[PDB]
Design a protein around this ligand. Sequence first.
Ligand SMILES: [Ca+2]
Ligand SMILES: [Ca+2]
Length: 293
Amino acid sequence: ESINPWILTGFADAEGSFSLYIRNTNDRPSRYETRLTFAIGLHYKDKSILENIQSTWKVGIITNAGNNVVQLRVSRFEDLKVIIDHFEKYPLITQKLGDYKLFKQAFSVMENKEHLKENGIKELVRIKAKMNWGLNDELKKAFPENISKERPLINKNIPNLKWLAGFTSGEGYFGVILAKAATVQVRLRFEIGQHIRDKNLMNSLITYLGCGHIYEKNKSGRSWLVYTVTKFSDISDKIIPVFQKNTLIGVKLEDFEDWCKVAKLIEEKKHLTESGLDEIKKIKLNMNKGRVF
DNA sequence: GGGGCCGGAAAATTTCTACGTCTGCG
DNA sequence: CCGCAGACGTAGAAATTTTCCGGCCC
Ligand SMILES: [Ca+2]
Ligand SMILES: [Ca+2]
């Protein structure tokens, strides 16, 4: 099977990373190891997606990262052209685009075979210093002048609903909340978490989907925004119809279907009856984390 | 030949997904 | 009072990254 190119980009914004590995490998003459890698790590539950991504790009190796996680890795340099080609037509809009643009700069250095010289390594370590989590402590002390490269910031809009379909397939959550004598209410909930570095992008969802709210949640010293929709009228009229015209991917798609089954049962006002609550309870206990198959 | 390149597993780190609740409201 | 839902919590694991041996192969 295959995946829509914008959906894949939306999924690449959610999951997947751009890696640059640098390592000292010799010293009699000083040499360094350099490798680029794009990798999407998923649960083996969604191994089908990686195979589908592998079916569209026709490159990359699926590895088993252990701990219930399979991973699609692409590292072959000639096969990297395929990925670059794709993301020029269907670009990322999150802050991962910055990690992507720096990833391309590393590709340019390795392509001109400059990474085999002292000038290329010194340039590459500056690129890595602004990518993801930056340089390791070894390279920080080996190359002290490593804060020269500019981290390209990103302020982009949502390209279309096709991108949103892929972004929801990764970060989305369709939950049937059974809120609990004054405690037995049924609630449908659709929320999306994201790092606060993409606050502008997250807030665009409210104006783009014409509904929803955003709440910041803190764990220890970390922070992430959560775009949330709870109003049922906004769900049945604005949230559900969107993901129907633009189909999701993975097992999250069937989670969406069961999420719709409850919605149709709620609009029919069967969620306030004894009978209609039974099939809802059966649905909620067999979806998301409630299912293992 | 030999050294950069690459299949492949896996540790490091955290940003997610999942799922409640308290509370005011009409 | 019942039902809706805004605002706001925590668990913990599916994720985001980084790691590098062995050994093809240009
Ligand atoms: Ca993400
Ligand atoms: Ca996901």
